[PDB]
Amino acid sequence: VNSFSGYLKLTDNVYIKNADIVEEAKKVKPTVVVNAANVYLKHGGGVAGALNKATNNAMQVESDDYIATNGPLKVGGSCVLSGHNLAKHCLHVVGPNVNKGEDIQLLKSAYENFNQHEVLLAPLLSAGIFGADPIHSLRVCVDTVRTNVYLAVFDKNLYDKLVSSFL
Numbered sequence: 259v260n261s262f263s264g265y266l267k268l269t270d271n272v273y274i275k276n277a278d279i280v281e282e283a284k285k286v287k288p289t290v291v292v293n294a295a296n297v298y299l300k301h302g303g304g305v306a307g308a309l310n311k312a313t314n315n316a317m318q319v320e321s322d323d324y325i326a327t328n329g330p331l332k333v334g335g336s337c338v339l340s341g342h343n344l345a346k347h348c349l350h351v352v353g354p355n356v357n358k359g360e361d362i363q364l365l366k367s368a369y370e371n372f373n374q375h376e377v378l379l380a381p382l383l384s385a386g387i388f389g390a391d392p393i394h395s396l397r398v399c400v401d402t403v404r405t406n407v408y409l410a411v412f413d414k415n416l417y418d419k420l421v422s423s424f425l
């Protein structure tokens with residue numbers, strides 16, 4: 259049993275809810291929240307801008323030190339950093355950004371990072387400001403992640419639609 263509440267069950271391991279990932283993280287304080295990161299860990303908007311704002315910019319400060327030491331992530335890659343006031347840990351995962359021309363095949367590689375964590379609160383990778391089809395992102399998630407993932411869809415139409423059209 260875990261603390262997640264109100265989710266619709268899609269598969270053995272994937273759950274979904276219409277939610278503001280920030281408000282959900284604050285309520286649950288999960289072990290892992292996933293950030294929709296870019297390779298520079300520049301958290302300006304969408305999930306990253308919203309998560310970072312909720313940390314009062316402490317996520318950005320920590321991220322800038324990470325990049326200064328390690329250099330940029332790979333598209334499809336990830337790093338584990340603090341969850342600050344939102345979670346124990348934040349898994350920063352870089353899905354491909356269609357609005358930068360990145361290979362959508364890298365979305366599967368991005369989701370494979372989730373398998374290193376038993377339970378996660380996450381957004382749909384490459385949805386929102388990253389420019390991929392969220393229906394596709396959910397399919398890749400279901401077909402890639404084997405650990406237990408609790409998905410936060412920001413848009414109500416998209417929440418109702420992802421459940422309405424799920425195979």
Ligand SMILES: O=C(O)Cn1nc(C(F)(F)F)c2c1CCCC2
Nearest residue numbers: 385386390392410411412413416
């Ligand atoms: O709903 C989400 O979680 C991210 N997300 N994803 C989309 C998308 F449909 F992919 F464009 C949209 C949003 C929110 C804003 C409306 C359109």
